[PDB]
Design an enzyme around this catalytic site. Structure first.
Site, PDB file in Angstrom:
ATOM      1  N   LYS B 335       0.820  -1.207   0.000  1.00 21.31           N
ATOM      2  CA  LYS B 335       0.000   0.000   0.000  1.00 21.31           C
ATOM      3  C   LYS B 335       0.857   1.261   0.000  1.00 21.31           C
ATOM      4  CE  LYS B 335      -1.480  -1.764   3.792  1.00 21.31           C
ATOM      5  NZ  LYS B 335      -1.228  -3.231   3.811  1.00 21.31           N
ATOM      6  N   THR B 336       1.890   1.293   0.844  1.00 18.79           N
ATOM      7  CA  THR B 336       2.729   2.483   0.954  1.00 18.79           C
ATOM      8  C   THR B 336       3.341   2.868  -0.387  1.00 18.79           C
ATOM      9  OG1 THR B 336       3.262   1.671   3.172  1.00 18.79           O
ATOM     10  CG2 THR B 336       4.512   3.562   2.348  1.00 18.79           C
ATOM     11  N   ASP B 389       0.517   7.213   7.224  1.00 14.02           N
ATOM     12  CA  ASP B 389       0.878   5.828   6.962  1.00 14.02           C
ATOM     13  C   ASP B 389       0.464   4.950   8.134  1.00 14.02           C
ATOM     14  OD1 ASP B 389       2.002   3.808   5.325  1.00 14.02           O
ATOM     15  OD2 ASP B 389       3.828   3.817   6.542  1.00 14.02           O
ATOM     16  N   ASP B 390      -0.019   3.749   7.817  1.00 12.14           N
ATOM     17  CA  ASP B 390      -0.364   2.737   8.812  1.00 12.14           C
ATOM     18  C   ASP B 390      -1.630   3.126   9.563  1.00 12.14           C
ATOM     19  OD1 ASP B 390       2.755   2.298   8.467  1.00 12.14           O
ATOM     20  OD2 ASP B 390       1.972   0.477   9.411  1.00 12.14           O
ATOM     21  N   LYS B 417     -11.157  17.158   9.648  1.00  8.52           N
ATOM     22  CA  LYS B 417     -12.276  18.006   9.254  1.00  8.52           C
ATOM     23  C   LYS B 417     -11.949  19.490   9.242  1.00  8.52           C
ATOM     24  CE  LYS B 417     -16.006  17.006  11.643  1.00  8.52           C
ATOM     25  NZ  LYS B 417     -16.657  16.498  12.883  1.00  8.52           N
ATOM     26  N   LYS B 494       5.433  -8.630  -1.702  1.00 12.24           N
ATOM     27  CA  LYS B 494       6.627  -8.539  -0.866  1.00 12.24           C
ATOM     28  C   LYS B 494       7.051  -9.917  -0.370  1.00 12.24           C
ATOM     29  CE  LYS B 494       8.507  -6.019   3.109  1.00 12.24           C
ATOM     30  NZ  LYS B 494       8.169  -5.426   4.433  1.00 12.24           N
TER      31      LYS B 494
HETATM   32  N1  LIG Z   1       2.840  -2.893  -8.477  1.00  9.31           N
HETATM   33  C1  LIG Z   1       3.307  -2.921  -7.224  1.00  9.31           C
HETATM   34  N2  LIG Z   1       2.438  -2.715  -6.210  1.00  9.31           N
HETATM   35  C2  LIG Z   1       2.897  -2.741  -4.956  1.00  9.31           C
HETATM   36  N3  LIG Z   1       4.143  -2.948  -4.526  1.00  9.31           N
HETATM   37  C3  LIG Z   1       4.981  -3.149  -5.549  1.00  9.31           C
HETATM   38  C4  LIG Z   1       4.656  -3.152  -6.895  1.00  9.31           C
HETATM   39  N4  LIG Z   1       5.780  -3.393  -7.670  1.00  9.31           N
HETATM   40  C5  LIG Z   1       6.741  -3.529  -6.789  1.00  9.31           C
HETATM   41  N5  LIG Z   1       6.331  -3.393  -5.488  1.00  9.31           N
HETATM   42  C6  LIG Z   1       7.162  -3.491  -4.294  1.00  9.31           C
HETATM   43  O1  LIG Z   1       6.301  -3.783  -3.225  1.00  9.31           O
HETATM   44  C7  LIG Z   1       6.995  -3.380  -2.037  1.00  9.31           C
HETATM   45  C8  LIG Z   1       5.959  -3.252  -0.953  1.00  9.31           C
HETATM   46  O2  LIG Z   1       6.344  -2.181  -0.064  1.00  9.31           O
HETATM   47  P1  LIG Z   1       5.933  -2.194   1.461  1.00  9.31           P
HETATM   48  O3  LIG Z   1       6.838  -3.043   2.260  1.00  9.31           O
HETATM   49  O4  LIG Z   1       5.817  -0.746   1.936  1.00  9.31           O
HETATM   50  O5  LIG Z   1       4.460  -2.789   1.429  1.00  9.31           O
HETATM   51  P2  LIG Z   1       3.143  -2.670   2.315  1.00  9.31           P
HETATM   52  O6  LIG Z   1       2.227  -3.830   1.925  1.00  9.31           O
HETATM   53  O7  LIG Z   1       2.547  -1.322   2.230  1.00  9.31           O
HETATM   54  O8  LIG Z   1       3.702  -2.980   3.772  1.00  9.31           O
HETATM   55  P3  LIG Z   1       3.232  -3.649   5.145  1.00  9.31           P
HETATM   56  O9  LIG Z   1       3.090  -5.138   4.819  1.00  9.31           O
HETATM   57  O10 LIG Z   1       4.419  -3.458   6.092  1.00  9.31           O
HETATM   58  O11 LIG Z   1       1.972  -3.018   5.630  1.00  9.31           O
HETATM   59  C9  LIG Z   1       7.545  -2.013  -2.428  1.00  9.31           C
HETATM   60  O12 LIG Z   1       8.831  -1.939  -1.829  1.00  9.31           O
HETATM   61  C10 LIG Z   1       7.798  -2.143  -3.940  1.00  9.31           C
HETATM   62  O13 LIG Z   1       9.192  -2.372  -4.081  1.00  9.31           O
END
Ligand SMILES: Nc1ncnc2c1ncn2[C@@H]1O[C@H](COP(=O)(O)OP(=O)(O)OP(=O)(O)O)[C@@H](O)[C@H]1O
Ligand SMILES: Nc1ncnc2c1ncn2[C@@H]1O[C@H](COP(=O)(O)OP(=O)(O)O)[C@@H](O)[C@H]1O
Lengths: 41, 526
Positions: B335-336, B389-390, B417, B494
């Site tokens: 998501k981030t 975030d989060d 708001k 991930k």
């Molecule tokens: N299309 C994509 N969508 C999402 N992430 C992608 C994509 N392509 C590559 N990534 C990789 O996915 C990784 C996910 O990042 P991150 O660890 O912030 O995920 P998150 O799901 O938001 O985290 P968390 O599991 O800690 O809540 C990013 O580092 C990016 O390198």
């Protein structure tokens, strides 16, 4: 919480008045007395 | 106005001249005929490093007054009892003595207070609940206007917190005027650049390829101090490059000396050690996104389209200057990265990212103060995009209990708001992972919309992702495809990355079996 008062450290005795030129003048007279007494002999 | 050091602010000087100094230029005879006293104070508030001390000095030097006395608010405070009052009083002895000696034929003095908000606060009303620094405020109030009269003084105050000043100190008897200085627009930035480059232009140290008019747009939300830093850094870099290159060959010094007019220098200073405090940051994306975006499926396109639509709606709306959006999905769904990509594609001037990583061990009050500071800074621009975030980690939610910090939740609910001043728009993007819990606290109704980001759903999508990554060959590609031909796949991107990395550590021959076994071990159903 305000740093409370403190006792005056102390007294450091030190006295200076008018000695320098008063004793230099005193000297200049004795020197002349010596010279005259020498001259008499 | 440009004839002097300052330049760029005129709408903020006409009023200050009129309502404060109209009686200082009319012939004295009429003034005494009417019998009106001059203004006794003015107040100025704005962002730091926006041209305040220079204006304060000029307003004094233009009145044929004596030397100003600079005083710093923090330095006044002391631990011993009865010293702050003496320090404050020390600044009025000369004026009092001169007034007494010369009657009513004296001149004009000046005082430049800095950070006055730290020695003036609302005094406690309840008995036993008075402020710890009320003596300083009492002394200042008494001195400014007391039983004794002063008519040859003028007090100027500066600060950045125009809301913590004691109300009693702003009545029309003391500091009856106020002014504000905002971020200079493109024209003001161009004027500042030309003022500071007048020297180079006169001495012929500027090139024809360096266009100040074009370079003005390259600075979107810069400040005067930052402009002076940029110019000086560019000159220093030009000197360094000159010494390095000119010593390379036995060429005439004059040719290299005039070579310092290159536009390279300025671009290098721009992207070198000039890091604005009110502008987009570029070094955080690398941390918040490590491998870009890979289009393993349709949902990415839909999410990006929705983000662009929201950005356009906030940029081209007049009845809704506040827009919110909530991103949610299963854990390890990425998501981030999508939030950061949307923020970058926004193309807004001010993009500040707030994360929980920079608050390890902070108390709740510290987190509230940080949130308030970030929002206050984001308010000072004509556009913004904040990214919470989060959320679930800010609150410290833990399944046992449940337990959480109430104050942080209240601050978030209240801030989601509040609307910015007229004409200034703002945008908030939030990312969580447990939408049901947020709905339980009755927060999901504060947001305006929700977006869904799913995980990999079918084997062929996994094959496409593997092909895009490019780590396995055609033989193993087909082997895996036939092995996972069924559409019963459920894995996070991930997690897929970590699994591939681990599988690569095995012996070259015994890799496919390892990866297949690891994938089978991991969850394969919702
Ligand atoms: N299309 C994509 N969508 C999402 N992430 C992608 C994509 N392509 C590559 N990534 C990789 O996915 C990784 C996910 O990042 P991150 O660890 O912030 O995920 P998150 O799901 O938001 O985290 P968390 O599991 O800690 O809540 C990013 O580092 C990016 O390198
Ligand atoms: N409008 C302006 N005109 C000229 N110089 C400016 C302007 N705004 C900022 N500066 C420069 O910013 C530098 C630092 O600002 P400073 O004097 O500390 O004021 P402030 O109290 O706003 O920080 C000064 O060297 C000043 O010349």
């Amino acid at each position: 919480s305000m740093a409370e008062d403190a006792d005056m450290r102390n007294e450091l005795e030190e006295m200076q008045r008018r000695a320098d030129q008063l004793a230099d003048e005193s000297l200049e007279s004795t020197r002349r007395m010596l010279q005259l007494v020498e001259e008499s002999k | 106005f440009e004839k002097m050091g300052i330049g760029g602010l005129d709408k903020e000087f006409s009023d200050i001249f009129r309502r404060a100094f109209a009686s200082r230029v009319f012939p004295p005879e009429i003034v005494e005929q009417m019998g009106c006293k001059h203004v006794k104070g003015i107040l100025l508030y704005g962002p730091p490093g926006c041209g305040k001390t220079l204006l304060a000095r000029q307003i004094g030097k233009m009145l044929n007054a004596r030397e100003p006395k600079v005083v710093n608010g923090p330095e006044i405070l002391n631990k011993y009892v009865g010293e702050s009052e003496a320090n404050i009083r020390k600044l009025f002895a000369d004026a009092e003595e001169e007034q007494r000696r010369l009657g009513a034929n004296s001149g004009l003095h000046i005082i430049i207070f800095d950070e006055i908000d730290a020695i003036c606060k609302q005094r406690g009303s309840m008995a036993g609940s008075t402020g710890v620094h009320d003596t300083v405020v009492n002394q200042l109030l008494s001195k400014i206007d007391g039983v004794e009269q002063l008519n040859n003084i003028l007090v100027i105050g500066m600060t950045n917190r125009p809301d913590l000043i004691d109300e009693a100190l702003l009545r029309p008897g003391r500091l009856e005027v106020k002014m504000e200085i905002g971020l200079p627009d493109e024209k003001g930035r161009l004027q500042i650049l030309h003022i500071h480059t007048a020297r180079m232009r006169g001495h012929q140290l500027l090139s024809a390829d360096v266009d100040i008019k074009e370079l003005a747009v390259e600075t979107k939300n810069f400040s005067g101090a930052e402009l002076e830093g940029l110019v000086r850094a560019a000159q220093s870099t030009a000197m360094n490059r000159h010494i390095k290159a000119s010593t390379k060959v036995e060429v005439d010094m004059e040719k290299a000396e005039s070579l310092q007019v290159t536009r390279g220098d300025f671009l290098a200073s721009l992207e070198n050690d000039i890091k604005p405090a009110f502008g987009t940051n570029q070094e955080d994306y690398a941390s918040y996104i490590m491998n870009g975006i890979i289009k393993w499926g349709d949902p990415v396109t839909r999410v990006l389209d929705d983000g662009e639509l929201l950005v356009q709606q906030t940029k081209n709306s007049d009845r809704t200057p506040l827009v919110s959006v909530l991103l949610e999905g299963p854990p390890h769904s990425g998501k981030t990265a999508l939030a950061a990509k949307i923020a970058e594609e926004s193309n807004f001037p001010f993009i500040k990212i707030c994360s929980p990583d920079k608050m390890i061990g902070f108390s709740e009050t510290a987190k509230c103060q940080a949130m308030k500071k970030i929002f206050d800074d984001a308010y000072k621009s004509q556009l913004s995009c904040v990214v919470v975030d989060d959320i679930e980690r800010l609150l410290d939610y833990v399944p046992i209990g449940p337990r959480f910090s109430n104050l942080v939740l209240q601050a978030l609910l209240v801030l989601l708001k509040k609307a910015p001043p007229q004409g200034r728009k703002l945008l908030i993007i939030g990312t969580t992972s447990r939408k049901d819990v947020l709905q339980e606290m009755e927060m999901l109704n504060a947001f305006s919309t929700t977006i869904h980001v799913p995980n990999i759903a079918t084997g062929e999508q996994l094959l496409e992702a593997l092909e895009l990554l490019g780590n396995f060959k055609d033989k193993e590609r087909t082997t895996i495809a036939q092995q996972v031909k069924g559409k019963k796949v459920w894995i996070g991107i991930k997690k897929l990355l970590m699994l591939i990395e681990m599988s690569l550590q095995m012996d070259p021959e015994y890799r496919v079996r390892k990866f297949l076994a690891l994938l089978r071990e991991e969850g394969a159903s919702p």
